[PDB]
Amino acid sequence: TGLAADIRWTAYGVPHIRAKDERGLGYGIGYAYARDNACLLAEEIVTARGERARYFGSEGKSSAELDNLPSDIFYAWLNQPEALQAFWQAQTPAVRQLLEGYAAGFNRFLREADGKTTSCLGQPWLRAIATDDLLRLTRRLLVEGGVGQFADALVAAAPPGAE
Amino acid sequence: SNAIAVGSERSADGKGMLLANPHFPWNGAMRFYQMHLTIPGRLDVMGASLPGLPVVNIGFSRHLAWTHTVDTSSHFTLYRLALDPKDPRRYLVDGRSLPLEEKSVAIEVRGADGKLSRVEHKVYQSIYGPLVVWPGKLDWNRSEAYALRDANLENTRVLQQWYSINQASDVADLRRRVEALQGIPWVNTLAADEQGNALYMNQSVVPYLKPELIPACAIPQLVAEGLPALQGQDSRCAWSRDPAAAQAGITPAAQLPVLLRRDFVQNSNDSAWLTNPASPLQGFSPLVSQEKPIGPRARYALSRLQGKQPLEAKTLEEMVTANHVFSADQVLPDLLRLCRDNQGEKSLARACAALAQWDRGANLDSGSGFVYFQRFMQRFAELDGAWKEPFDAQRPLDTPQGIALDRPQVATQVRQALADAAAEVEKSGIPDGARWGDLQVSTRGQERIAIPGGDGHFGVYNAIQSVRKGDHLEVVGGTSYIQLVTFPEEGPKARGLLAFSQSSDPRSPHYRDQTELFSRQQWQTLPFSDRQIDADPQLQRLSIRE
Numbered sequence: 001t002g003l004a005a006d007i008r009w010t011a012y013g014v015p016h017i018r019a020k021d022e023r024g025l026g027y028g029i030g031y032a033y034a035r036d037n038a039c040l041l042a043e044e045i046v047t048a049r050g051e052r053a054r055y056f057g058s059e060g061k062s063s064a065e066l067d068n069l070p071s072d073i074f075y076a077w078l079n080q081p082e083a084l085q086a087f088w089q090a091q092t093p094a095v096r097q098l099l100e101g102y103a104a105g106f107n108r109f110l111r112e113a114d115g116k117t118t119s120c121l122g123q124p125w126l127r128a129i130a131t132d133d134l135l136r137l138t139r140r141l142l143v144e145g146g147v148g149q150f151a152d153a154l155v156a157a158a159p160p161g162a163e
Numbered sequence: 164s165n166a167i168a169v170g171s172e173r174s175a176d177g178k179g180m181l182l183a184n185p186h187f188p189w190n191g192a193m194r195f196y197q198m199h200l201t202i203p204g205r206l207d208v209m210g211a212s213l214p215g216l217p218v219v220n221i222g223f224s225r226h227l228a229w230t231h232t233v234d235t236s237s238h239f240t241l242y243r244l245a246l247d248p249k250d251p252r253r254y255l256v257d258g259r260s261l262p263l264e265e266k267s268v269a270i271e272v273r274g275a276d277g278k279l280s281r282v283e284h285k286v287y288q289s290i291y292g293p294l295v296v297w298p299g300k301l302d303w304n305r306s307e308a309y310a311l312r313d314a315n316l317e318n319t320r321v322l323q324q325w326y327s328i329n330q331a332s333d334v335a336d337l338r339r340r341v342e343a344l345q346g347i348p349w350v351n352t353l354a355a356d357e358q359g360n361a362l363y364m365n366q367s368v369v370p371y372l373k374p375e376l377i378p379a380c381a382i383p384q385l386v387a388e389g390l391p392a393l394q395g396q397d398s399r400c401a402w403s404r405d406p407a408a409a410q411a412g413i414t415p416a417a418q419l420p421v422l423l424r425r426d427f428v429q430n431s432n433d434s435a436w437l438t439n440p441a442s443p444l445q446g447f448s449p450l451v452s453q454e455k456p457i458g459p460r461a462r463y464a465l466s467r468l469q470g471k472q473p474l475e476a477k478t479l480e481e482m483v484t485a486n487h488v489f490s491a492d493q494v495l496p497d498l499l500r501l502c503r504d505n506q507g508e509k510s511l512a513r514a515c516a517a518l519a520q521w522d523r524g525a526n527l528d529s530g531s532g533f534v535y536f537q538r539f540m541q542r543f544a545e546l547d548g549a550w551k552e553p554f555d556a557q558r559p560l561d562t563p564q565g566i567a568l569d570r571p572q573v574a575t576q577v578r579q580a581l582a583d584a585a586a587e588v589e590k591s592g593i594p595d596g597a598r599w600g601d602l603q604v605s606t607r608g609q610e611r612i613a614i615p616g617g618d619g620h621f622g623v624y625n626a627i628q629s630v631r632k633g634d635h636l637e638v639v640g641g642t643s644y645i646q647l648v649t650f651p652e653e654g655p656k657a658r659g660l661l662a663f664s665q666s667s668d669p670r671s672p673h674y675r676d677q678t679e680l681f682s683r684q685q686w687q688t689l690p691f692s693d694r695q696i697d698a699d700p701q702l703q704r705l706s707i708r709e
């Protein structure tokens with residue numbers, strides 16, 4: 001609660017979010033983004049949670065073109081509970097509030113969606129999100145210039161046998 | 164990505180100007196999204212962000228505009244491990260054998276039967292980070308293995324960093340806010356303000372090694388090819404500590420390249436070196452910035468930016484919308500000369516005709532000459548010593564240039580390259596008289612939209628990356644969020660587009676509306692002031708609470 005936003009859309013569906021605080025601001029952002037891109041965020045959250053193989057099997061790929069199972073191993077490793085907790089604990093009050101608002105705003109859209117702008121309505125992977133999910137996405141981007149470029153290589157790293 | 168910031172000494176109005184032309188994917192976790200954020204009295208910022216982020220990543224405010232490009236700095240180091248000769252799951256640091264740590268993750272997998280089965284996977288870790296294997300290059304044998312230390316894993320400041328940037332007043336404030344927090348993971352920052360300051364910052368999270376440690380700590384064979392690799396058997400090759408750095412082991416802000424000028428700064432994914440050739444940035448760690456030959460995009464930009472004539476907003480817009488294939492400038496004059504030298508050669512006739520008629524562009528109506536040129540360049544790149552003028556460090560903006568046709572071996576190899584390129588083009592199913600826009604498209608539902616631009620490696624400022632899919636080249640990345648900002652008295656004037664449109668969902672009214680506009684290269688106002696927003700006849704409003 002204590003979440004409120006004023007949203008104006010101009011030409012081409014560009015939102016202009018006005019709020020009195022970070023949680024309200026995040027609320028407006030999450031709602032507006034969900035209207036245009038709920039399915040996209042849901043997919044990328046599945047990726048960052050390492051749940052691609054769970055929903056889609058091992059034959060598919062992520063939008064980064066990694067195989068589902070190797071992608072899942074990498075993201076489960078990257079986004080372990082301990083890492084997410086430490087990340088969360090290091091966040092400023094303002095950032096925590098932005099993220100809390102965002103999750104609530106996205107979830108509000110999901111509750112009310114009738115399919116007008118959402119093609120994945122009814123899919124089991126289109127689900128309410130949590131602030132941890134937003135941290136998973138943040139960390140996925142954080143390592144795009146680092147260990148993320150070696151995701152396949154990390155998965156493939158196994159000690160030698162008797163050769 | 165491209166970025167150009169113009170200051171008071173070069174702008175037509177004596178104020179700041181910024182062109183932001185990031186090159187990012189058209190789908191997925193890095194798909195830009197436009198938004199304007201306001202907490203009245205203390206935050207008012209507009210631009211674009213990435214999926215799931217509640218802050219603007221590239222944008223503008225009352226007195227400031229900023230953007231980002233991917234930098235050439237290292238944001239991790241590999242560590243070559245010396246394995247314990249008695250145990251390949253142990254490794255040596257200062258001659259002492261340490262055990263690898265094992266972290267298992269469990270993944271659920273949906274089978275053909277629709278049921279879930281559990282897969283357990285072991286991730287081996289050293290003191291530096293996880294082990295990585297690139298078969299045939301970075302192996303894990305009985306002698307050596309490789310671990311990877313990612314500097315951004317400890318960067319918990321990233322979200323706060325962009326929220327802070329969103330609150331920045333001018334260029335000086337922006338610089339203070341970024342240098343103070345050091346939360347930018349892997350991009351340069353370029354900015355301009357109303358007062359006419361132009362800023363470049365190579366201010367990101369970069370592993371720190373003191374200068375004297377590099378020669379002994381580098382892996383010689385791996386650094387030649389630009390992999391940041393260090394000796395993992397020596398404790399002295401740990402990242403250096405400096406209390407001034409925001410994060411232990413990263414490079415302090417004062418040691419990273421910055422250029423603050425009143426003429427211009429630019430970057431097209433090369434190092435800091437030639438941000439502005441009048442003031443080269445040199446003497447930095449190899450992990451930070453090196454004096455490497457610039458790409459054709461930067462070479463193109465500098466060709467348009469240098470000199471003393473004022474720069475107008477129109478000039479910067481047209482640097483994008485011209486779709487000039489700048490790599491043609493170095494090669495095509497001499498390639499056409501070879502064509503005239505080989506008249507009556509049946510294998511070269513179609514190629515040489517297409518090339519001579521070609522407008523040297525990646526426009527929608529651009530002729531098949533572009534396709535011939537691309538296939539030739541892919542082969543020309545593999546040839547040795549074919550440049551008439553090789554890269555000259557003393558002339559880094561004007562070299563390499565021309566084909567060494569006076570050299571008989573080069574003449575034979577270049578002609579063969581063109582024959583082979585022509586054979587490939589003609590082998591593929593390309594209709595007679597077809598244009599570039601007939602080939603390169605973005606799919607929207609069952610429809611296609613023609614997309615102008617070409618690969619940045621050919622020096623097209625409007626960089627577009629596409630992949631063959633059926634009968635077409637499908638756009639996957641490149642020009643994305645475009646913003647061009649000036650500062651007239653009334654308030655910031657922003658113009659641009661989101662090339663792929665706001666919504667990735669085919670059902671949305673905003674799935675292809677800006678993509679139609681991008682095809683026609685018709686940029687639009689990005690409304691920021693209450694007046695601009697209220698003037699829009701499409702204005703809609705919703706207030707929500709819970």
Ligand SMILES: C=CCNc1ncnc2ccc(Br)cc12
Nearest residue numbers: 141142216220231321322325348
């Ligand atoms: C283009 C801007 C790059 N911006 C970012 N690059 C990597 N990781 C990030 C994580 C959070 C945020 Br906010 C922004 C990030």
